[PDB]
């Protein structure tokens, strides 16, 4: 399938060059997987998540998202314009106020959440979760991380915006996990993004156009932006059968562009997500 026109991010993920603007994927688009949005919450019944996405958890007054973070995640994961897995099932749970904010005990909450709610839906294909949050490090929120991981779900997490050593914030310093750094349109490292050693994978994050609260639109930038991306990207592979919950990170990384980013600090893997379609 081709999407015509569609954000540089889509066509980065399925090309062998950056400056293209087509998005193609196999149609089967990650129908029957399932991508837990852990966040600020979506705004499920915006268009472009066609009744795909419902809110399962909030730890706050409302399940609705009044920040537009989590519905700008989801979108990248699977809105019908702006996702990578278009026919996946998105689930919402609220660990972030509309501040974006959250104590690491909701956190941690959140993701035991997840390793449990699984068993309550259908998702024959496999299971992600997608984690665009993150704060200083902790061996408590990297242990929860590594237990939703070791559950049977693919986890992805934001490396950080710090500039900096991913080794000092969590979760995207636990090994476990797939860590996720942002690249730009001229695949240069995100001036913004953090690097090291813990990095699995870079994906688009600067300037990514996805869905916001209130129905509309609209273009950011972070790490939080990368890991749908990957997240969306391992739906995508596990609806084609590619790989496994527990083996989607090394996979992505296995079957990546490589060598392909600049300013990537020695040390640091030189691999950009990519879906390897041949249409």
């Given at each position: 399938?081709?999407?015509?026109?569609?954000?540089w991010?889509?066509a980065?993920?399925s090309?062998?060059?950056?400056?293209?603007?087509t998005?193609?994927?196999?149609?089967?688009?990650?129908?029957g997987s399932c991508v837990?949005v852990?966040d600020?919450?979506?705004?499920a019944?915006?268009?472009?998540?066609?009744?795909r996405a419902?809110?399962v958890?909030?730890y706050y007054y409302?399940?609705?998202?009044?920040?537009?973070?989590g519905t700008?995640c989801?979108?990248?994961?699977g809105?019908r314009?702006?996702?990578?897995?278009?026919?996946t099932?998105?689930?919402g749970?609220?660990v972030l106020d509309?501040?974006?904010?959250?104590?690491?005990?909701t956190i941690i909450?959140?993701?035991?959440?997840?390793?449990?709610?699984?068993?309550?839906?259908?998702?024959?294909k496999?299971v992600?979760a997608?984690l665009?949050?993150?704060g200083?490090?902790?061996?408590?929120?990297?242990?929860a991380?590594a237990?939703?991981?070791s559950?049977?779900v693919m986890?992805?997490v934001?490396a950080?915006?710090?500039n900096?050593?991913?080794?000092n914030?969590?979760?995207a310093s636990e090994?476990?996990?797939c860590?996720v750094?942002?690249?730009?349109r001229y695949?240069?490292?995100?001036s913004?993004?953090?690097?090291?050693?813990?990095l699995?994978?870079f994906?688009?994050g600067?300037?990514?156009?996805?869905?916001?609260?209130?129905?509309?639109?609209?273009?950011?930038?972070?790490?939080?932006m990368?890991?749908?991306?990957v997240?969306g990207?391992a739906?995508?592979?596990?609806?084609?059968g590619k790989?496994?919950?527990?083996?989607?990170?090394r996979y992505?990384a296995?079957?990546?562009?490589?060598?392909?980013?600049?300013?990537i600090?020695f040390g640091?893997?030189?691999?950009?997500?990519y879906?390897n379609?041949?249409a």
């Open positions: 399938a081709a999407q015509t026109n569609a954000p991010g889509l980065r993920i090309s062998t060059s950056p400056g293209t603007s998005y193609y994927y196999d149609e089967s688009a990650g129908q837990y852990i600020t919450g979506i705004e019944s915006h268009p472009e998540f066609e009744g419902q809110m958890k909030t409302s399940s609705r998202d009044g920040n537009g973070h700008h989801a979108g990248t994961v809105s314009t702006y996702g990578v897995a278009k026919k099932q998105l689930f749970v609220k509309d501040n974006g904010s959250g104590q690491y005990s909450a959140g993701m035991d959440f997840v390793a449990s709610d699984k068993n309550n839906r259908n998702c024959p496999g992600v997608s665009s949050l993150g200083g490090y902790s061996s408590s929120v990297n242990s991380a237990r939703l991981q559950s049977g986890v992805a934001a950080g915006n710090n900096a050593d991913a080794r914030y969590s979760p090994p476990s996990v860590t750094g942002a690249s730009d695949d240069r490292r995100s913004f993004s953090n690097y090291g050693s813990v699995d994978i994906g688009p600067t300037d990514i156009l996805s869905t916001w609260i209130g129905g509309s639109t609209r273009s950011i930038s972070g790490t939080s990368a890991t749908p991306h997240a990207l739906a995508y592979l596990m609806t084609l790989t496994t919950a527990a083996s989607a990170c992505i296995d079957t990546a562009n490589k060598g392909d980013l600049s300013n600090p640091t893997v030189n691999l950009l997500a879906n379609y041949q």
